[PDB]
Amino acid sequence: ARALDLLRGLPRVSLANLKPNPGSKKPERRPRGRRRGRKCGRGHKGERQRGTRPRLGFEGGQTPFYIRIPKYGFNEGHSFRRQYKPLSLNRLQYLIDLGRVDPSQPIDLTQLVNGRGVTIQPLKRDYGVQLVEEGADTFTAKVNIEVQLASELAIAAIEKNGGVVTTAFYDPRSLDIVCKPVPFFLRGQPIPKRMLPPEELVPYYTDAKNRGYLADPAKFPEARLELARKYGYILPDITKDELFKMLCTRKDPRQIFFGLAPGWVVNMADKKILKPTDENLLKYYTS
Partner 1 sequence: IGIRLTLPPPKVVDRWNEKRAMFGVYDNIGILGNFEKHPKELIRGPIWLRGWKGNELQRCIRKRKMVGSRMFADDLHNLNKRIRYLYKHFNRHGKFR
Partner 2 sequence: FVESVDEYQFVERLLPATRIPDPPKHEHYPTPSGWQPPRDPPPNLPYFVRRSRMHNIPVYKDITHGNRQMTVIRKVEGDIWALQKDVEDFLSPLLGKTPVTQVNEVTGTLRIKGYFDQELKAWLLEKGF
Partner 3 sequence: YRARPPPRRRPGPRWPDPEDLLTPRWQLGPRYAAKQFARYGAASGVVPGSL
Q: Which of 6, 278, 283, 287 binds partner 2 (CB under 8 A)?
A: 278
Number of residues that bind partner 1 (CB under 8 A): 9
Give the C-alpha separation, 112 to 100, whole Å: 9
Using the minimum distance from each CB to partner 1, give the nearer residue, 3 or 56. Answer: 56
Residues 155/211, Cβ–Cβ less than 8 Å: yes
Interface with partner 1 (CB under 8 A), residue from 4, 56, 67, 182 = 56
Our CB check for partner 2 shows the closer of 151 and 161 to be 161
Indicate which of partner 1, partner 2, partner 3, none lies near residue 42 (CB less than 5 to 8 Å, by partner kind).
Answer: partner 1
213 contacts partner 2 (rule: CB under 8 A):
no
- Cα 213 to chain center, whole Å? 20
Cα torsion 16, 17, 22, 28 to 10°: value is: 10
Of partner 1, partner 2, partner 3, none, which one does residue 140 interact with (CB within 5 to 8 Å by kind)?
Answer: partner 2
By the rule CB under 8 A, 117 interacts with partner 2:
no
189's contact among partner 1, partner 3, partner 2, none, with CB below 5 to 8 A by partner kind, is partner 3
Judged by CB under 8 A, the residue of 202, 228, 247, 265 near partner 3 is 265
Nearer to partner 2, 116 or 173 (CB): 116
Count how many Cα atoms sit within 13 Å of the Cα of residue 238 in the half-sphere of its side chain. 23
Taking CB under 8 A as the rule, does residue 29 contact partner 1?
no
Site for partner 2 contains 275 (CB under 8 A):
yes
Which of the listed partners (partner 3, partner 1, partner 2, none) does 53 bind, with a CB threshold of 5 to 8 Å by partner kind? partner 1
CB of residue 51 to partner 1, shortest distance in Å: 4
Torsion-angle region of 211 (φ positive above 0: left; ψ -120 to 50: alpha; else: beta):
left
Residue-wise over 81-115: b if at least 16 C-beta within 10 A, else e?
eeebbebbbebbbebbeeeebebeebbbbbbbbeb
Q: Are 92 and 162 in contact (CB under 8 A)?
A: no
Backbone Cα Rg of the chain: 30
- The count of chain residues that interact with partner 3, using the rule CB under 8 A, is 13
The pattern of x and - marking residues 173 through 212 that bind partner 3 according to CB under 8 A reads ------------xxxxxx----------------------
Exposed e or buried b for every residue in 130-162, given b needs 16+ CB within 10 A? bbbbbbbeebebbbbbbbbbbeebbbbbbbbeb
Q: DSSP code of 47?
A: H
Could you say which of 49, 90, 151, 206 contacts partner 2 (CB under 8 A)? Answer: 90
How far apart, in whole angstroms, are the C-alpha atoms of residue 64 and residue 227? Answer: 55
- Can you spell out the DSSP letters for 129-162? EEEE-TT-TT-----EEEES-B-HHHHHHHHTTT
Site of interaction with partner 2 (CB under 8 A): 90, 93-94, 97-100, 105, 110-111, 113-116, 138-141, 181-182, 185, 257-260, 266, 268, 271-278
Site of interaction with partner 1 (CB under 8 A): 41-42, 48, 51-56
